[PDB]
Design an enzyme around this catalytic site. Structure first.
Site, short mmCIF file in Angstrom:
data_model
loop_
_atom_site.label_atom_id
_atom_site.label_comp_id
_atom_site.label_asym_id
_atom_site.label_seq_id
_atom_site.Cartn_x
_atom_site.Cartn_y
_atom_site.Cartn_z
N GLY B 30 0.80 -1.21 0.00
CA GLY B 30 0.00 0.00 0.00
C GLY B 30 0.84 1.27 0.00
N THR B 31 0.15 2.40 -0.15
CA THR B 31 0.83 3.69 -0.17
C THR B 31 1.42 4.00 1.21
OG1 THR B 31 -0.99 5.14 0.51
CG2 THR B 31 -0.98 4.37 -1.76
N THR B 32 2.37 4.93 1.22
CA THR B 32 3.07 5.27 2.45
C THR B 32 2.22 6.19 3.32
OG1 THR B 32 5.12 5.13 1.19
CG2 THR B 32 5.25 6.05 3.41
#
Lengths: 233, 141
Positions: B30-32
């Site tokens: 997933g995104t940070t």
């Protein structure tokens, strides 16, 4: 609530050319005992709505908690919670009225009379009343309890029909509200001298005056009343 | 033996729950999203992948709010994060209703933790595919 215990008396309110004004005395009576002074019965919801509650104080505190949680849940996942999607007076009133009618239909009513006053997003004044039966109505002047019998005549003298609202300055409306509170203190056995008032105006903010007192009390003529008829001294 | 990673809540011979670790794999993809505890508060930040310029900017918010003092951001399956945030909102609501004060951050953390851990006890449910950074200010800072 099947029978009220600690109760609050009249809540009065009226519209004026720019907004609404609503007042309620800071008293929680326990039967005929003026037990709890300093009971705030006007609940501002945000910055454009004030809910005035009369009747059972425990149910009033329940309504307070419901309004707080409604504001909180409106804030959820809503970046416009401080703007376009903020809580409107009509929303708060419809929620309250749904709750009151459901409680009435379950034979367990919230023993209160509620006046939601405020200004809509389009500047239109909102002033509506619901009670423990679920009955709802709106008028240029609204009052609960004794105010509905005494304050409403004085306030309708100022705003009798819709056409009189734009002609009513905030000074006139506030003076009428204060005079009605004084009359209520005169003739209501379960009222208090100290009261709170709230003005919701479309041009200025929400003004919440606390710790107001009924002043200019006419009592001098009482010295000339002697006996109950034939007593001369 | 083999087949330990096919069902949830099943212990492998090394004492692991492989379905949870696969959920962690889904999280890592997933995104940070980060959180920084400062002297008197917390800050949360997240990267939102602009897949195309057809996405309306400043919309599609990822950071969520619980009660009025808790902030939650997550990396992984966004819907699982929304589910966990809804559960946490119910927990905070019930805590406020019973104990009056808003829920402290450790209490809220344990509510979320018990919920997520309970989702690793049965094969009839899937582990949560999110990692959650949350927090805020209570009476203890």
């Amino acid at each position: 609530t099947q029978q009220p215990i600690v109760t609050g008396t009249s809540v009065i309110s009226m519209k004026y050319d720019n907004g609404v004004i609503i007042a309620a005395d800071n008293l929680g009576s326990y039967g005929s005992l003026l037990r709890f002074n300093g009971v705030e019965r006007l609940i501002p919801v945000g910055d454009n709505t004030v809910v005035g509650i009369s009747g059972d104080i425990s149910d009033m505190q329940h309504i307070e908690r419901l309004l707080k949680d409604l504001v909180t849940e409106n804030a959820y996942d809503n970046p416009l919670a401080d703007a376009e999607e903020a809580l409107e007076p009509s929303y708060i009133f419809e929620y309250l009225a749904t709750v009151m009618y459901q409680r009435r239909s379950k034979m367990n009513p919230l023993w209160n009379a509620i006046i939601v006053a405020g200004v809509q997003s389009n500047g239109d004044q909102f002033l509506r009343y619901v009670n423990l039966l679920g009955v709802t109505y709106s008028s240029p002047t609204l009052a609960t309890g004794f105010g509905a019998h005494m304050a409403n005549p004085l306030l309708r003298k100022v705003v009798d029909r819709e056409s009189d609202i734009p002609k009513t300055t905030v000074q006139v409306a506030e003076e009428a509200i204060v005079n009605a509170m004084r009359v209520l203190y005169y003739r209501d056995a379960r009222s208090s001298r100290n009261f709170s008032l709230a003005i919701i105006d479309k041009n200025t903010g929400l003004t919440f005056k606390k710790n107001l007192q009924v002043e200019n009390m006419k009592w001098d003529f009482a010295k000339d009343i002697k006996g109950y008829g034939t007593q001369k001294i | 033996g083999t087949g330990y990673d096919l069902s949830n809540s099943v212990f492998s011979p090394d004492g692991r729950n492989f379905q949870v670790e696969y959920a962690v794999k889904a999280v890592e993809n997933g995104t940070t999203s980060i959180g920084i505890k400062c002297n008197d508060g917390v800050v949360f930040a997240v990267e939102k992948l602009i897949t195309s310029k057809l996405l309306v900017p400043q919309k599609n918010v990822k950071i969520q709010v619980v009660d009025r003092h808790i902030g939650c951001v997550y990396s992984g399956l966004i819907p699982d994060g929304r589910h966990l945030v809804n559960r946490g909102r119910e927990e905070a609501a019930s805590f406020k209703k019973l104990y009056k004060t808003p829920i402290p951050i450790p209490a809220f953390a344990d509510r979320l933790g018990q919920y997520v851990q309970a989702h690793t006890l049965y094969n009839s449910v899937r582990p949560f595919g999110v990692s959650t950074i949350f927090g805020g200010v209570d009476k203890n800072g």
